[PDB]
Amino acid sequence: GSRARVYAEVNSLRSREYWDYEAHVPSWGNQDDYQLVRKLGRGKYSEVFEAINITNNERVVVKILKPVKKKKIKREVKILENLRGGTNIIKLIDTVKDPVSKTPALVFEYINNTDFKQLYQILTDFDIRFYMYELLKALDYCHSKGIMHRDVKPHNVMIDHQQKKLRLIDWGLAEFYHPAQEYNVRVASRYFKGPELLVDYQMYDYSLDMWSLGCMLASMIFRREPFFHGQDNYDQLVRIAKVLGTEELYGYLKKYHIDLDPHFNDILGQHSRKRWENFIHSENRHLVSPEALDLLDKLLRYDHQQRLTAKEAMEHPYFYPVVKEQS
Ligand SMILES: CC(C)n1c2c(c3c1-c1c(Br)c(Br)c(Br)c(Br)c1C3=O)C(=O)CCC2
Ligand SMILES: [Cl-]
Ligand SMILES: [Cl-]
């Protein structure tokens, strides 16, 4: 069966306590040190506030967890602790509880996030290379720590475009990679789901995140955001196949002995693989280069095992101008 080409055995080479999150016992500090200032948003399992630590005036973000999901809380906490100090991963400052109700919350460093819908229409060529390289550092780091993020998307990539700071947030879907483990395919947001998820292939790996980052790259260089805009999970695969091709999808399915839900037979149609240059027009031509297309072509592949790793992507000539500037 399938396995990651990189960091496949890394959790097995570490102490069991590293990855056995169910056994993790967080130290829960006191939420009363924090003053909530403003609500920033809400997820299925949390609500997020900007806050101030009253003891030292630090501005932070507090994510208050809906507390009936103990295993999932331990997972997110243990993952964040393991990722401590990783480049461009959001910093977990503390794990706290309301001392009376015992409701848990996560305290993060604050980032002054620029709205991505506005930002992605003003990025320059260099900006895209820069931010994509910064995001890749976060993914290479978390992959090297045996963790798949499983929800990479613009809303989870905080960018302070004034300070040029990027942080990958929202680790609540992340999981430890173990070779041959079958994972739930109900992860990632629709537009960023890899084909593997859409065809119910459970033996996926870190390369799922590389598909999602390819989707982000394509939206930035082509200015079509999201790049693959499905109406539902079925239509999402059709949108992919209209670009990557249907015969090419079937070759992937055949390689991995993947069974295709027969509802797809009535909607996939027949589509040639499209040239990436077909997406260029006057509005995006200044963001597209041969090196951007070569990189994108190596990310947005059906075959998860053939996608570039985060490191291989960082190594691509598209990022040479960023490396040189950083030197
Ligand atoms: C997009 C924004 C409104 N946002 C959301 C979430 C989170 C944020 C957010 C921001 Br912004 C910042 Br800044 C930091 Br730091 C951190 Br941590 C978070 C965070 O965890 C969710 O968890 C789900 C709903 C939306
Ligand atoms: Cl899972
Ligand atoms: Cl298209």
Curated annotation (Swiss-Prot):
What GO biological process term is on the record, naming one?
spermatogenesis
* Residues found modified as Phosphotyrosine: 7
Tell me where in this chain the Protein kinase domain is found.
Answer: 34-319
What Pfam families does the entry give? Pkinase (PF00069)
User: What residues bear Phosphoserine in this entry?
Assistant: 12, 15, 282
> How is the activity of this protein regulated?
Constitutively active protein kinase whose activity is not directly affected by phosphorylation. Seems to be regulated by level of expression and localization.
Q: Which UniProt keywords apply?
A: Acetylation, Apoptosis, ATP-binding, Cell cycle, Cytoplasm, Kinase, Nucleotide-binding, Nucleus, Phosphoprotein, Serine/threonine-protein kinase, Transcription, Transcription regulation, Transferase, Wnt signaling pathway
The record, for SMART domains, names: S_TKc
Q: Which GO terms describe its molecular function?
A: ATP binding; protein serine kinase activity; protein serine/threonine kinase activity
Instruction: From the record, give the cysteines joined by S-S bonds.
Output: none
Q: Where in the cell is it found?
A: Nucleus; Cytoplasm
Q: Can you tell me which residues form the catalytic site?
A: 151 (proton acceptor)
Its EC number is 2.7.11.1
In this chain, ATP is annotated as bound at: 40-48, 63
Report the catalytic activity: L-seryl-[protein] + ATP = O-phospho-L-seryl-[protein] + ADP + H(+); L-threonyl-[protein] + ATP = O-phospho-L-threonyl-[protein] + ADP + H(+)
List the record's Gene Ontology CC terms alphabetically.
acrosomal vesicle; chromatin; cytosol; nucleoplasm; nucleus; protein kinase CK2 complex
In the record, N6-acetyllysine modifications are located at: 91
Q: Which family does it belong to?
A: Belongs to the protein kinase superfamily. Ser/Thr protein kinase family. CK2 subfamily.
Q: Subunit structure of this entry?
A: Heterotetramer composed of two catalytic subunits (alpha chain and/or alpha' chain) and two regulatory subunits (beta chains). The tetramer can exist as a combination of 2 alpha/2 beta, 2 alpha'/2 beta or 1 alpha/1 alpha'/2 beta subunits. Also part of a CK2-SPT16-SSRP1 complex composed of SSRP1, SUPT16H, CSNK2A1, CSNK2A2 and CSNK2B, which forms following UV irradiation. Interacts with CSNK2A2IP (via C-terminus). Interacts with SIRT6; preventing CSNK2A2 localization to the nucleus. Interacts with RNPS1. Interacts with HIRIP3.
Write out the function statement from the record.
Catalytic subunit of a constitutively active serine/threonine-protein kinase complex that phosphorylates a large number of substrates containing acidic residues C-terminal to the phosphorylated serine or threonine. Regulates numerous cellular processes, such as cell cycle progression, apoptosis and transcription, as well as viral infection. May act as a regulatory node which integrates and coordinates numerous signals leading to an appropriate cellular response.
Q: What else is known?
A: Can use both ATP and GTP as phosphoryl donors. Phosphorylation by casein kinase 2 has been estimated to represent up to one quarter of the eukaryotic phosphoproteome.
Stored PANTHER family? CASEIN KINASE II SUBUNIT ALPHA (PTHR24054:SF34)
UniProt name for this protein: Casein kinase II subunit alpha'
The protein's organism comes out as: Homo sapiens
